[PDB]
Design an enzyme around this catalytic site. Structure first.
Site, PDB file in Angstrom:
ATOM      1  N   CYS C 155       0.826  -1.205   0.000  1.00  0.00           N
ATOM      2  CA  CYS C 155       0.000   0.000   0.000  1.00  0.00           C
ATOM      3  C   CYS C 155       0.862   1.257   0.000  1.00  0.00           C
ATOM      4  O   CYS C 155       0.623   2.191  -0.776  1.00  0.00           O
ATOM      5  CB  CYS C 155      -0.939   0.001   1.216  1.00  0.00           C
ATOM      6  SG  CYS C 155      -0.123  -0.364   2.803  1.00  0.00           S
ATOM      7  N   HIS C 182       0.682   5.080   9.810  1.00  0.00           N
ATOM      8  CA  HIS C 182      -0.019   4.030   9.090  1.00  0.00           C
ATOM      9  C   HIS C 182      -1.045   3.382  10.014  1.00  0.00           C
ATOM     10  O   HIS C 182      -0.739   3.072  11.170  1.00  0.00           O
ATOM     11  CB  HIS C 182       1.015   3.008   8.570  1.00  0.00           C
ATOM     12  CG  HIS C 182       0.485   2.051   7.545  1.00  0.00           C
ATOM     13  ND1 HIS C 182      -0.486   1.113   7.829  1.00  0.00           N
ATOM     14  CD2 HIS C 182       0.812   1.872   6.241  1.00  0.00           C
ATOM     15  CE1 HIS C 182      -0.742   0.402   6.741  1.00  0.00           C
ATOM     16  NE2 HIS C 182       0.032   0.842   5.763  1.00  0.00           N
TER      17      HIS C 182
HETATM   18  N1  LIG Z   1      -4.368  -4.617   4.974  1.00  0.00           N
HETATM   19  C1  LIG Z   1      -3.666  -3.760   4.215  1.00  0.00           C
HETATM   20  O1  LIG Z   1      -3.726  -2.549   4.374  1.00  0.00           O
HETATM   21  C2  LIG Z   1      -2.784  -4.285   3.107  1.00  0.00           C
HETATM   22  C3  LIG Z   1      -2.428  -3.418   2.073  1.00  0.00           C
HETATM   23  C4  LIG Z   1      -1.627  -3.879   1.035  1.00  0.00           C
HETATM   24  C5  LIG Z   1      -1.224  -5.208   1.058  1.00  0.00           C
HETATM   25  N2  LIG Z   1      -1.554  -6.029   2.069  1.00  0.00           N
HETATM   26  C6  LIG Z   1      -1.089  -7.416   1.983  1.00  0.00           C
HETATM   27  O2  LIG Z   1      -2.198  -8.267   1.638  1.00  0.00           O
HETATM   28  C7  LIG Z   1      -2.019  -9.570   2.218  1.00  0.00           C
HETATM   29  C8  LIG Z   1      -3.236  -9.901   3.083  1.00  0.00           C
HETATM   30  O3  LIG Z   1      -3.397  -8.879   4.077  1.00  0.00           O
HETATM   31  P1  LIG Z   1      -4.795  -8.658   4.861  1.00  0.00           P
HETATM   32  O4  LIG Z   1      -4.701  -7.356   5.631  1.00  0.00           O
HETATM   33  O5  LIG Z   1      -5.975  -8.901   3.950  1.00  0.00           O
HETATM   34  O6  LIG Z   1      -4.655  -9.871   5.918  1.00  0.00           O
HETATM   35  P2  LIG Z   1      -5.866 -10.734   6.570  1.00  0.00           P
HETATM   36  O7  LIG Z   1      -5.224 -11.450   7.734  1.00  0.00           O
HETATM   37  O8  LIG Z   1      -7.088  -9.884   6.743  1.00  0.00           O
HETATM   38  O9  LIG Z   1      -6.176 -11.753   5.369  1.00  0.00           O
HETATM   39  C9  LIG Z   1      -5.473 -12.966   5.142  1.00  0.00           C
HETATM   40  C10 LIG Z   1      -6.517 -14.027   4.817  1.00  0.00           C
HETATM   41  O10 LIG Z   1      -5.876 -15.230   4.410  1.00  0.00           O
HETATM   42  C11 LIG Z   1      -6.400 -16.319   5.182  1.00  0.00           C
HETATM   43  N3  LIG Z   1      -5.333 -17.335   5.201  1.00  0.00           N
HETATM   44  C12 LIG Z   1      -4.240 -17.378   5.983  1.00  0.00           C
HETATM   45  N4  LIG Z   1      -3.473 -18.454   5.657  1.00  0.00           N
HETATM   46  C13 LIG Z   1      -4.094 -19.098   4.650  1.00  0.00           C
HETATM   47  C14 LIG Z   1      -3.826 -20.308   3.834  1.00  0.00           C
HETATM   48  N5  LIG Z   1      -2.708 -21.037   4.056  1.00  0.00           N
HETATM   49  N6  LIG Z   1      -4.720 -20.635   2.875  1.00  0.00           N
HETATM   50  C15 LIG Z   1      -5.834 -19.898   2.657  1.00  0.00           C
HETATM   51  N7  LIG Z   1      -6.156 -18.790   3.364  1.00  0.00           N
HETATM   52  C16 LIG Z   1      -5.320 -18.358   4.351  1.00  0.00           C
HETATM   53  C17 LIG Z   1      -6.743 -15.715   6.520  1.00  0.00           C
HETATM   54  O11 LIG Z   1      -7.731 -16.510   7.175  1.00  0.00           O
HETATM   55  C18 LIG Z   1      -7.316 -14.394   6.060  1.00  0.00           C
HETATM   56  O12 LIG Z   1      -8.667 -14.610   5.648  1.00  0.00           O
HETATM   57  C19 LIG Z   1      -0.731  -9.485   3.023  1.00  0.00           C
HETATM   58  O13 LIG Z   1       0.310  -9.965   2.168  1.00  0.00           O
HETATM   59  C20 LIG Z   1      -0.564  -7.995   3.276  1.00  0.00           C
HETATM   60  O14 LIG Z   1       0.790  -7.604   3.553  1.00  0.00           O
HETATM   61  C21 LIG Z   1      -2.343  -5.610   3.082  1.00  0.00           C
END
Ligand SMILES: NC(=O)c1ccc[n+]([C@@H]2O[C@H](COP(=O)([O-])OP(=O)(O)OC[C@H]3O[C@@H](n4cnc5c(N)ncnc54)[C@H](O)[C@@H]3O)[C@@H](O)[C@H]2O)c1
Ligand SMILES: NC(=O)c1ccc[n+]([C@@H]2O[C@H](COP(=O)([O-])OP(=O)(O)OC[C@H]3O[C@@H](n4cnc5c(N)ncnc54)[C@H](O)[C@@H]3O)[C@@H](O)[C@H]2O)c1
Ligand SMILES: NC(=O)c1ccc[n+]([C@@H]2O[C@H](COP(=O)([O-])OP(=O)(O)OC[C@H]3O[C@@H](n4cnc5c(N)ncnc54)[C@H](O)[C@@H]3O)[C@@H](O)[C@H]2O)c1
Ligand SMILES: NC(=O)c1ccc[n+]([C@@H]2O[C@H](COP(=O)([O-])OP(=O)(O)OC[C@H]3O[C@@H](n4cnc5c(N)ncnc54)[C@H](O)[C@@H]3O)[C@@H](O)[C@H]2O)c1
Ligand SMILES: [Mg+2]
Ligand SMILES: [Mg+2]
Lengths: 338, 338, 338, 338
Positions: C155, C182
């Site tokens: 992000c 952040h």
């Molecule tokens: N939240 C943000 O602001 C943001 C912004 C940009 C990028 N990201 C990136 O996006 C990715 C996800 O972040 P998020 O905030 O949505 O996290 P989150 O924890 O909300 O989502 C992760 C999801 O994956 C599921 N999960 C975990 N292990 C798994 C597996 N082995 N198989 C299937 N499902 C599985 C979890 O249950 C959860 O539903 C990360 O790489 C993060 O760094 C997040």
């Protein structure tokens, strides 16, 4: 002809009320023509458009100059005087004052608007003393057009009283306790600072804060049968809006949770449609932002013990839902202005 | 023969200062003998004892009656008048006023205490102009006893200026930008409400709020050679105490992160002992509650690019650490009374 | 002929992405046909519809049964297996996997989707090495159809890189430091608990938490000329969404704040339209919820010292704005399939 | 001789318990010799010393190496295995396991510690199924030394049951409803994420979250007379620690608030000394951090309606007070090890 309205105190309720009226302006007997506030029109136009809770107002353009706020071309005159006696209500032809400052809840305080030239005053809070109190959907039909100062009670009273009315007419309430787990409000302090209430003095987003609730007394004003039979407290907690009231009643007619829910469900579809909402969903406070009902029964939490001890739980948007009811009460007064 | 002190404004700074003095009064030239505040002594004694940030005051008993707050047998007389010209400073024999209301930061405003009978005034904030400004450990040894109105600058200035001084003497600061990620303060609004600053108007526990910082101008007042060479902003965030300042400097002598940390560490052990603390630990804001230093360098975050672009990051307890410095400056003034 | 998409990890990014596609699927080359997640479809459909940040999903009905989530008559098949090699990508005819679990960011990890039968993988995070990284509006037009595993960076990278590109072409960035203030994310702990990062271990809604930012390395990947010239940190603070990045650059061509704002404004109206938004309003983080731009320059905060030290400040909705970019990159990949 | 203790799950309760034992180590029949946790000893030593809620541990030095945590020279062996059956309890001579992971609350789950070599297991939560449950000060004297798996109930049960016992023996409780307005815990989600409980799935520091409370069932286990006569719910709110329970009871013997308060006051001085604290002070949740009592009656909030409907309100530190009671129950078991 329109009933001309002035808002006194352009705060959370004043501005929620303005935005309620703006969205219902095609069916209103009311014209908001004036605002009095501690601030200036440019500052108040900015807060009207950019709201941390409601989001950015998108329906119409909001601008301002030295003298007025403009909302989709509709000019609202602005004045700034802390003493209502000096306000130009006579000159502006103000019919109804929405008294939303929090500091003029007595008859002597609110009456200063009458001597400045307003015809009626609707206080957005429980009244201090001898002031007729109304909850829409509970007792607003007993409104007497001759009354020049009225109270719309409090947010918690508007959530609890419609439910209490339904339960009382169905099971007969003998005694009842209420606790509202309640979002903080501007009456509380951001950090520990002096306050007439030593608990409301304390950092609001850091603490669970026990305090009084207007509903403890006001529910028995709008349901006179229950005067002296209800009591309770508030717990202020670190959310900025949306509240939930827990109500435990000793009832006369034995019942069970299924029947309690069915009675409120039927009411929410008929006599209380648009005041009570019935929900079987597993939601949390954020989900009820912007809900128009006075109370949302959380049906999954209803419990009854031993036939006669009933517990119900209801949500309410204490800013927006209450403001919708202020607007409803003002429209009712406009319809029975005679 | 003690210097008799009154506190004007018994707020966050006023009460943190009182608790600082109570913990240090064995080796003190000051005696706090009076308080002026908008509130009464029973309320103020309650708030002095029960503090959402500092916890319950442990050392001595705190009581009150209509006239005084009592802190372990020491009586502090109380009065309540918003106009400093009416205060009983002559009758109470007040020598030094700690001006902590936030509303008398100009010379004419603070001078009202002198016409009421106090001899000197210490403003717990940047002055509005033509008021000498001091930061303990940076320029307080230039204090002249002939100055009867002084400023202790702001919390951010007290954190940034010691580090800037060290960096400037070692590397030569040519320009510098600052951003403090700063806990919210009583100046901000709990829910959206009118304010002269349209961003400080917005719900403080809900929002990241950009605003001005006093350090942007005041660092160059306590380090005159850097006048006009520094600038920056604040981001208020939803924590109630403890802040962190991020400083990026263009420096003349090329360097690397390891040397920058060595220079600050050496100073924190000698010329800046008790003002700058050097930390190599991986901590967060909660861990610095109650820290006595003006600045805690977070050494793990130091970075340098191309030799001349230096970034340092320092924590500060903006309530307690700043109040420790107010006390230090008042002790220094008491030591140099004539 | 649509590109068939599965989401791996139905989290904050996974569900924001789904709601982005649902709002844009009229002009889309993508069809979301499957979901893999640790949870079941009834739970995931509940969370898709009821979102504490986005509010209740309004456009279409959302339901579920044991096998599928249904979004306005569109069926999305669901499975639940933590090991991507077992997923039914071949049987479901999956073309593109959106890898949003946070745990398969290396090439070998994301490649498990290819051995399960998908053709390409888009990782919603920086890759762990030897994975091409794209930022829409900065370098996504260098995407080559032969690359079957790509990264959309972070992000903060998506907010900072467009502004850095504009500034570098206009003034020549020699070095630059960044700090993002952040919102907290699911990676952090609600209360103090074990974590590989000892500061992300600490209660996220209580603390200012210094930590790393992906932008520090990834900006130099999408702008190769700046490799090694940028560095910075993050401060996680107790807001649940929306962040702001502070960037201080040493630039070659001397300039002033007004020219910097003109250069970014001109770009926001032409080469960066829809990626950079230029704002002269005095807003706070709540006002940027749901903003579609990658970067909102807060023009009132721009500062320049000595001609060569430039500070800019930009907002970003780290959940929704980033997910809009994930969708943009997937559309671009779908357009360049061979 | 000492009873040798191992902690399974070094979380909020595990670490609070460790710090409780460290401060009472001069009078204990217990020696904490081992820890099993998902994390490593260096990470766990860091969280033991630096606590967002308790502050920095100051009583003794805390360090760690590859195999042990050291607290004032006392070596605690550390292991890391998610399956209790594989744990080295036999080799370490472990007498009592404090089961604080939250995932082994059944007899079959907890018994895995017995087959790994432990003599007894004390579960820091309500037991699933056929597990004897104890609240110190209510029924711990009925503990049978022959029982090898026990439960200390929940935080809310430990607050509510001592009060219920007093009120029942004084007025005769016929039916009773409870609502605890409760700090969030690690079982909830920082941001909306999948959870077996659809409301605990939602952003915990942003929402009021209705959910179940262990006290609804467990109070009737430790006061068998009241089985099936009590019910209630929890409302989780955005504070990180300290909770308050509201209890509304239908009683047999008519009474008034003065008498209710006097009965609890007398109990707090005699039969319930150190379990119930009686307070007439106007405090808020932050003021009860670190309180050692199981329940603090807020005497100012007691109400009675019509003789037989009683409402009481009591505070509790759900982390520290509960952990003090875990320690008390473990000392009792050590005294009656036979
Ligand atoms: N939240 C943000 O602001 C943001 C912004 C940009 C990028 N990201 C990136 O996006 C990715 C996800 O972040 P998020 O905030 O949505 O996290 P989150 O924890 O909300 O989502 C992760 C999801 O994956 C599921 N999960 C975990 N292990 C798994 C597996 N082995 N198989 C299937 N499902 C599985 C979890 O249950 C959860 O539903 C990360 O790489 C993060 O760094 C997040
Ligand atoms: N916020 C709620 O949830 C809620 C719900 C129901 C009722 N109420 C009641 O509505 C009233 C307003 O509450 P609020 O939350 O909007 O508070 P607020 O502080 O947001 O609004 C008060 C407004 O009145 C202005 N004001 C104060 N004194 C004034 C004076 N002498 N003359 C003119 N303007 C003045 C203030 O500047 C502010 O704009 C209170 O009585 C409150 O009890 C509030
Ligand atoms: N809070 C901080 O972190 C911090 C740090 C450094 C400096 N400061 C400065 O200290 C000053 C006080 O800040 P604070 O956070 O303690 O604010 P505060 O609002 O907590 O305290 C101000 C006190 O003054 C009282 N007051 C207001 N007007 C008064 C009058 N006319 N006469 C007497 N009493 C009056 C208020 O009731 C309140 O008790 C401000 O100048 C502020 O900028 C604050
Ligand atoms: N926090 C409270 O207020 C409170 C009060 C009373 C009782 N409890 C109960 O105490 C228990 C622990 O709660 P908590 O708040 O400390 O939770 P927590 O998440 O802080 O602690 C759980 C700990 O156990 C570890 N863990 C998880 N699975 C494990 C396994 N298989 N083997 C070894 N370690 C494992 C985790 O890493 C974590 O350190 C829960 O049953 C909870 O219901 C909590
Ligand atoms: Mg250089
Ligand atoms: Mg230059």
């Amino acid at each position: 002809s329109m009933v001309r309205v002035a808002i006194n105190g352009f705060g959370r309720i004043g501005r929620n009320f303005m935005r309620c009226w703006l969205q219902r302006k095609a069916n209103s007997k009311l014209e908001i023509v004036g605002i009095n506030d501690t601030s200036d029109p440019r500052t108040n136009a900015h807060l009207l458009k950019y709201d941390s809770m409601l989001g950015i107002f998108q329906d119409a353009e909001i601008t301002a100059d030295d003298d007025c706020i403009y909302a989709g071309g509709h000019a609202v005159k602005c004045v700034s005087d802390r003493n209502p006696e000096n306000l130009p209500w006579s000159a502006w032809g103000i019919d109804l004052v929405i008294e939303a400052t929090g500091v003029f809840t007595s008859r002597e305080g609110a009456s200063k608007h009458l001597s400045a030239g307003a015809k009626k005053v609707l206080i957005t809070a429980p009244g201090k003393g001898n002031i007729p109190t109304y909850v829409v959907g509970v007792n607003h039909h007993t409104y007497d057009p001759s009354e020049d100062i009225v109270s719309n009670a409090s947010c918690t009273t508007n959530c609890l009283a419609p439910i209490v009315k339904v339960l009382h007419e169905a099971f007969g309430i003998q005694q009842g306790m209420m606790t509202t787990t309640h979002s903080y409000t501007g009456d509380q302090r951001l950090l520990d600072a002096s306050h007439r209430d030593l608990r409301r003095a304390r950092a609001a987003a850091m603490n669970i804060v026990p305090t009084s609730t207007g509903a403890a007394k006001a529910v028995g004003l709008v349901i006179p049968e229950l005067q002296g039979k209800l009591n309770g407290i508030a717990l202020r907690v670190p959310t900025p809006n949306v509240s939930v009231v827990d109500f435990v009643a000793q009832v006369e007619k034995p019942t069970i949770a299924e029947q309690v829910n069915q009675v409120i469900k039927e009411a929410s579809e008929t006599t209380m449609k648009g005041i009570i909402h019935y929900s079987e969903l597993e939601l949390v406070s954020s989900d009820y932002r912007g809900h128009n009902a006075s109370s949302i029964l959380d049906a999954s939490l209803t419990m009854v013990l031993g036939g006669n001890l009933v517990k119900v739980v209801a949500w309410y948007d204490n800013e927006w839902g209450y403001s919708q009811r202020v607007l409803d009460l003002a429209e009712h007064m406009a319809a029975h202005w005679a």
